[PDB]
Curated annotation (Swiss-Prot):
Range within the parent protein: 265 to 364 of 727
Organism listed in the record: Homo sapiens (Human)
Sites of Phosphothreonine modification: T25, T53
Assembly and interaction partners: Interacts with CHD8. Interacts with LLPH. Interacts with CENPE. Interacts with BRD2; promoting BRD2 recruitment to chromatin.
Localization: Nucleus, Nucleoplasm; Chromosome; Chromosome, Centromere
Family: Belongs to the CTCF zinc-finger protein family.
Protein name, UniProt field: Transcriptional repressor CTCF
Note from the entry: More than 13'00 CTCF-binding sites in potential insulators were identified in the human genome.
Zinc fingers, C2H2-type class: 2-24, 30-52, 58-81, 87-100
Role summary: Chromatin binding factor that binds to DNA sequence specific sites and regulates the 3D structure of chromatin. Binds together strands of DNA, thus forming chromatin loops, and anchors DNA to cellular structures, such as the nuclear lamina. Defines the boundaries between active and heterochromatic DNA via binding to chromatin insulators, thereby preventing interaction between promoter and nearby enhancers and silencers. Plays a critical role in the epigenetic regulation. Participates in the allele-specific gene expression at the imprinted IGF2/H19 gene locus.
Record's disease association: Intellectual developmental disorder, autosomal dominant 21: A disorder characterized by significantly below average general intellectual functioning associated with impairments in adaptive behavior and manifested during the developmental period. Additional MRD21 features include short stature, microcephaly, and developmental delay.
Amino acid sequence: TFQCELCSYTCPRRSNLDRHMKSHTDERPHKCHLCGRAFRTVTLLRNHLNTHTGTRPHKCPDCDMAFVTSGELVRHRRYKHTHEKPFKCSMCDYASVEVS
DNA sequence: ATTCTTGTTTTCATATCCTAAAATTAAAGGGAAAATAAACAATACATAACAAAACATATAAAAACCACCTCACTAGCGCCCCCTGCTGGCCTCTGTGGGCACTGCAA
Ligand SMILES: [Zn+2]
Ligand SMILES: [Zn+2]
Ligand SMILES: [Zn+2]
Ligand SMILES: [Zn+2]
């Protein structure tokens, strides 16, 4: 029912349309007090500051290294600890942690 | 002298009036059965008052619904070796090409 004007975005929640309009309008009100980089939400700026300094809270349960976000630890476990490999190739027997 | 009209009392007469006995007839008096009316008492209907039940409003009491925030997942593109195999000179060690001095044989 809900439709977009800038693109063919179709959702059922008005709040989803609101966020999509915020993405089109690029409301970035969160700057970094070290570099000119800016973001739209607080968690992005929090991770950016957790990269300018070493304050990595997501610790690896199987080794002693760490990362700022969860997805990086997910893929680290699928590379090094639980070799998942969901996506597989066409001809060869290849598979890896990322679609890239 | 004889004949003829006219006015007035006498007396029958015929209608009327009065009188009384019958009859009679309607009034009127009383006995009694209907009979309408009326005085009183009873029943039913209608009206008013009191009390309660039903209806409507306010309010707040959980409670339901909607929207926003947030903490992750899902894509995304570099990023960075890393390993592995071919490629294109490079160089030096065998190996291809040659000039020429040297020898053994038999004149
Ligand atoms: Zn759009
Ligand atoms: Zn910064
Ligand atoms: Zn680890
Ligand atoms: Zn393949």
